[PDB]
Structure 1
């Protein structure tokens, strides 16, 4: 996946879209606006490098690069921002609905071929490389050109041309009084038609709920941290890329702005002699270390040379049984090693053979790791990983090697001496009962970082000028109420068995 993502929102502006069947139900136009705003927010948080556009068709006024009638391009393909979100929200309310009607109009003839043509023109106007070209059609009508067949053929031809070009189109059908029949006219326009999505739809599209589900997490495309070299011998060599399947999430770095005008300010640093008052360079400086009364002076190049043992890469040392790899011997997050094949040919077969043989023998490959030049070597273990996929053939664990850092002697610390005190069988049984009561299934993505979520919510409130920032419920709390209600009298019995009455913990 190389390039950017392009999304164009097509919101129909017919009379039927501006009417609500039942009370306490937002009109389809407002629902589309909210969905667009949610998508904009999700794109801003996850990846702001993508391009989003908003185009309205069926309006009285027209604004297009070709001067097509009855089409308005509210926002051209550009990176999302708070200004576009506010502009969309301006039409959110009923007063916003009136403003949209006054400044845009509604209830005019339109051609699907025309909107597809303007969308294609917008796509062709992007100078950046687009990995995905997508269009979303928000419309509750299923038979727009029911009074004319030539327009239907023109729309079919335009949709076919867009499909051939590589444009991927979706129809976000909304609620209709009578019902939505995709099989009537839109079946031949959607890029992919599902067999299930054939019956008449009397409710909202399921995609709308997914779109409205805001996601707050940065999405990073696949990228190799380093294309290192694995050397089984001074002559045998292969190339392997290193990836970080797990990486700590940090909030975006702050930026300095000028209070008076709120503009970026450049930060610079300089070094000069207090006597000569002239600029100095790193090559005109020495590093000093004072131990007691003695002073030791070394050049910067010498200090860099201090931590130089071997060239960057991985050097094989041997194979060790997996039983000898302690679970508690953890120092840094593990990495993933996968064959590259873009540098040396024939490495993939060797990697596969090594993986299968290590899995059969249950042996991890011990190696010396030097991620970069002038970096002290470390001892790492590569444990083979078996490609694991859950139901419906979705991968959950890729095949390769898991690189785990083995702590050195210095990294280990000695604990204070303690006297063992065995627990009686009754107390162990009570604890077993408590644990069984508090049983729960764990998954890798069952918790959210409260700090990052709160920061994102605060930034959203600041940018959109919202009244207050919606408090983010944190799942990291132990919800003591439910645990107490579930345990019952087990805690009291355990305290009586273990804790003496005159303890007061």
Structure 2
């Protein structure tokens, strides 16, 4: 969808006396559950997609304010970019004392009408000016029949909800919890896009993740040309990036204001001010000095116009894993520049896959960049698990190292092992099996940095101090393999360390 557009999620909780103090047992509370869900998802969205929009608005309350001054509707925080000033507002309600505050500030929960609730949350989406990529509404209620008493209210409810379904807005409820009354065919089968007393769909909204994402962002579009005449349009995209911590901003010590760094360069002999034209680049070779233009120090790189230079093809066994150089990239046609080039792209991909052969190219990502040698190794698509995209179809960009990279190894001799040790190592390596999944692990540094960020943003009673799968679970290795370390010691270990 339109990239500049942004995701928008509005939060809407049943504020009636129904679930404010349901608390059948003393281990949970639906309001203490819904607010927990909202806080968790909203803090996750802080780090994840800080560019997006969230809003929380309660219905059925007794105090009133909204855009249209209606009855029993409270817009707690409007639609805006997420921030701590609202983390605190939500946190103010978390607690039995907090629920006391909520009830004596907005109300026990009066009469309501989800028609007017849909009417008003629609107004919230309408209000804000930034374009919206996706628009989702989350209800939080368990009164599976909003009203079996006034059918006219319910008819107007279907009408307005169907309208929202056709104004571009989706709607969603997770059935939180109710003694009985845990069904969706009662008035909601026609609303949302078998059933039980609790929603799995709300459990994952507690998964409490700190990832971040960027949309289908073309890193650079370059025109792959087969020769000097045939040219096709390729979008160099990125599929692994090594996220770094967000770059810090320098702030004034009491005033916490931005400080607008103003680095400059000027003379030492005089109190003048050197201008960018007024400086020269230099090196020192052979006990003699060198001068070039600041313009020339970048002209020393002009090698080829931007694009891709296919020369020939290679067998996929000759392209070796042993000589990785840079994060790989992905190749996919972009129909916009050269119309119809997608056909030729597909032809090359299919036929190369058929003959199990690589494609070699010269890659000049932008101007003023020396070219490297890159392999267009085709990739087949796989969808088998649930018919959802896993490996996008197209070409890799396996960068091929230049000679100056080999880093000649300090040769040492080899000593073969005896087949007895390798035979027992067979069992050793078998025992420590574990299936590896691409998203198995997290950066302890990035995760902990984000965590400390929330900790300071809120002063929540301790920092989270997340423990992460990066550290090995030592007892597991000592146990599930046994004491075979001593076996290999008595096999191939003399007394010295």
TM > 0.5 between the two? yes
CA drift at 1:217: 0.7
Distance 1:362 1:217 in 2: 36
Deviations along 1:100-143, one digit per CA (max 9) or x if unpaired, are 11110123111111111111111110100001111111011012
Aligned twin of 1:153: 155
RMSD over aligned Cα atoms: 1.4
CA drift at 1:303: 1.3
CA drift at 1:42: 1.3
Deviations along 1:285-342, one digit per CA (max 9) or x if unpaired, are 1111122421111111111111111111111111111111111111111110111010
Distance 1:178 1:436 in 2: 50
On the 8 A contact 1:116/1:159 being kept in 2, the answer is: yes
Deviates more, 1:267-276 or 1:25-34: 267-276
Distance 2:243 2:384 in 1: 26
* SS of residue paired to 1:38: helix
CA drift at 1:502: 4.3
Aligned twin of 2:445: 451
> Does residue 267 of the first structure (1) align with residue 285 of the second (2)?
no
Deviates more, 1:291-300 or 1:341-350: 291-300
On the 8 A contact 1:384/1:400 being kept in 2, the answer is: yes
Distance 1:181 1:413 in 2: 67
Deviates more, 1:484-493 or 1:237-246: 484-493
CA drift at 1:229: 1.2
Aligned twin of 1:386: 380
Distance 2:9 2:267 in 1: 56
CA drift at 1:487: 1.9
Distance 1:470 1:24 in 2: 26
On the 8 A contact 1:179/1:202 being kept in 2, the answer is: no
CA drift at 1:277: 2.4
Number of residue pairs matched by the alignment: 495
Distance 1:270 1:225 in 2: 31
Distance 1:480 1:114 in 2: 58
CA drift at 1:64: 0.9
On the 8 A contact 1:133/1:166 being kept in 2, the answer is: yes
TM-score (norm 1): 0.95
CA drift at 1:203: 2.0
* SS of residue paired to 1:457: helix
Distance 2:437 2:138 in 1: 33
* SS of residue paired to 2:185: coil
On the 8 A contact 1:179/1:201 being kept in 2, the answer is: no
Distance 1:203 1:28 in 2: 12
Deviations along 1:164-204, one digit per CA (max 9) or x if unpaired, are 1111001122211222222122222224xxxxxxxx85521
Deviations along 1:23-46, one digit per CA (max 9) or x if unpaired, are 332211111101110111111011
Q: Structure 1 residue runs of 4+, over 3 Å off?
A: none
Distance 1:34 1:490 in 2: 48
CA drift at 1:360: 1.1
On the 8 A contact 1:140/1:173 being kept in 2, the answer is: yes
On the 8 A contact 2:23/2:30 being kept in 1, the answer is: no
CA drift at 1:93: 0.3
On the 8 A contact 2:143/2:181 being kept in 1, the answer is: no
TM-score (norm 2): 0.97
Distance 2:492 2:269 in 1: 72
Deviations along 1:212-260, one digit per CA (max 9) or x if unpaired, are 1111111111111110011111111111000110110101111111111
Distance 2:213 2:175 in 1: 28
Distance 2:487 2:95 in 1: 59
Distance 1:245 1:150 in 2: 53
* SS of residue paired to 1:44: helix
Distance 1:497 1:181 in 2: 66
On the 8 A contact 1:21/1:177 being kept in 2, the answer is: no
Go from structure 1 to structure 2 and tell me whether the alpha carbon gap of 1:271 and 1:427 turns closer, same or farther (over 3 Å shift): same
Aligned twin of 1:471: 465
Deviates more, 1:20-29 or 1:340-349: 20-29
Q: Which of 455, 465, 487 is 1:461 aligned to?
A: 455
CA drift at 1:21: 4.1
